[PDB]
Design an enzyme around this catalytic site. Structure first.
Site, mmCIF file in Angstrom:
data_model
loop_
_atom_site.group_PDB
_atom_site.id
_atom_site.type_symbol
_atom_site.label_atom_id
_atom_site.label_comp_id
_atom_site.label_asym_id
_atom_site.label_seq_id
_atom_site.Cartn_x
_atom_site.Cartn_y
_atom_site.Cartn_z
ATOM 1 N N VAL A 116 0.819 -1.214 0.000
ATOM 2 C CA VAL A 116 0.000 0.000 0.000
ATOM 3 C C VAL A 116 0.853 1.265 0.000
ATOM 4 O O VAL A 116 1.779 1.400 0.803
ATOM 5 C CB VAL A 116 -1.003 0.037 1.191
ATOM 6 C CG1 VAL A 116 -2.158 -0.927 0.950
ATOM 7 C CG2 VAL A 116 -0.307 -0.262 2.522
ATOM 8 N N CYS A 117 0.535 2.186 -0.907
ATOM 9 C CA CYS A 117 1.252 3.453 -0.995
ATOM 10 C C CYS A 117 0.312 4.651 -0.933
ATOM 11 O O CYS A 117 -0.774 4.632 -1.522
ATOM 12 C CB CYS A 117 2.095 3.511 -2.270
ATOM 13 S SG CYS A 117 1.150 3.538 -3.824
ATOM 14 N N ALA A 118 0.739 5.684 -0.209
ATOM 15 C CA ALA A 118 0.025 6.955 -0.159
ATOM 16 C C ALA A 118 0.303 7.763 -1.427
ATOM 17 O O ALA A 118 1.437 7.789 -1.922
ATOM 18 C CB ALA A 118 0.422 7.743 1.082
#
EC number: 1.11.1.24
Lengths: 166, 164
Positions: free
Chosen positions: A59-61
Site C-alpha cells: 500500500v502506498c500513499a
C-alpha cells in the site's frame, strides 16, 4: 543526538541531520542490480534524498508517489529513495515503481551513511533501520532543505521541499 | 571461499565444525522482536542460512526439507537471511510451516561473524552465505555444511540423518 517517535513511543536517532547550509558527506549505496552508486556520480544535479524506515510495502500513499514523480520531472534533478531494505524488496515500492529519474538505494553496503546523515535509529524494534527524513541538495552538495519528521508514521513537508527547487 | 556465478568470494571467519559449541546469538523475528538462541532451550536447532529468501518462486525442495525437520520431535527450524522481517514473509520455503521461524540479520551482524557466513566480496558483500548448521538439545554442532556455490543446494539428507 535527536529524538523522534514511532506511534508515540520515543526513538533515539544517532548523529545530526545536515542543517541548511551544510556540505553533505559523500556516500556510496547499493542499486537494484546490486551495482554500487556514489553521490559523486550525480555532480551538478540536484538530489532529493527521501529517507524511509522501510519502502517494502504493498500500500502506498498518493502524496509519496506524487512528490517523487513531480521532483523527478524537474529539470536537472534526481530522486533517491533510501532505506535499510534489501534491493530485492526495494523494487516493489510504488513511490519509485516506474518513476523516471527516481532510483532506489540500499544500506546493505556503505551503512556508515546512516550515522553521517543523522538517520541511524539505534534503539528499540527499529534498530538497524533509518529514521524518516527528506534532505534536498544543490548542484555542489550543499543542503537547501532538510527535515527530520518528529513522528515516523507521518509525512514530511512535501510542498516546502518542492518550493526550494524552487 | 565460496563462489557466485562466476568467480571466488571471501567469507569472514569460518563455519563451526562438528563437536564445537554453537555460541549464543540474537536475531530479529517477523514481529521485529529480539529472539536469542537460548530461548529454544532443550530443542534441536536447524540453522538454514540463506543469502536471500525474498522470492516468489522456490525449488520446493527447500520447503520440503524445512517441513520434514519441522515435523521431527523436539526440533526448531531457524531460517536465517539478511532480508528484513518485511521481506521474509513472502518466502516460498517457510510459508505457514509449523516449527519453521524466519530470523533477520538486521541488528545481528555479530551472528554473521560467530558462525562464519558473512560475505565480504562481490555484488553480494554484506549478504549471508548458503550454509546449514545442525545443533542438538545442548547446542552442540552435529552437522555443518558451507556450500561453495550459492545457487547450489546443501546436503539435506545428511542434515536430516544427524537428527536421527
Amino acid at each position: 543526538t535527536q529524538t523522534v517517535h514511532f506511534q508515540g513511543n520515543p526513538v533515539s536517532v544517532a548523529g545530526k541531520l545536515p542543517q541548511i547550509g551544510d556540505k553533505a558527506k559523500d556516500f556510496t549505496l547499493v542499486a537494484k542490480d546490486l551495482s554500487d552508486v556514489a553521490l559523486s556520480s550525480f555532480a551538478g544535479k540536484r538530489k532529493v534524498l527521501n529517507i524511509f524506515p522501510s519502502i517494502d510495502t504493498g500500500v502506498c500513499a498518493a502524496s509519496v508517489r506524487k512528490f517523487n514523480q513531480l521532483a523527478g520531472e524537474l529539470e536537472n534533478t534526481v530522486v533517491l529513495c533510501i532505506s535499510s531494505d534489501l534491493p530485492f524488496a526495494q523494487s516493489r515500492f510504488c513511490g519509485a515503481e516506474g518513476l523516471s529519474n527516481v532510483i532506489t538505494l540500499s544500506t546493505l553496503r556503505g551503512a556508515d551513511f546512516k550515522q553521517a546523515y543523522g538517520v541511524a535509529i539505534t534503539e528499540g524494534p527499529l534498530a538497524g533501520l533509518t529514521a524518516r527524513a527528506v534532505v534536498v541538495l544543490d548542484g555542489q552538495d550543499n543542503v537547501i532543505y532538510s527535515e527530520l519528521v518528529n513522528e515516523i508514521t507521518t509525512e514530511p513537508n512535501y510542498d516546502a521541499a518542492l518550493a526550494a527547487l524552487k
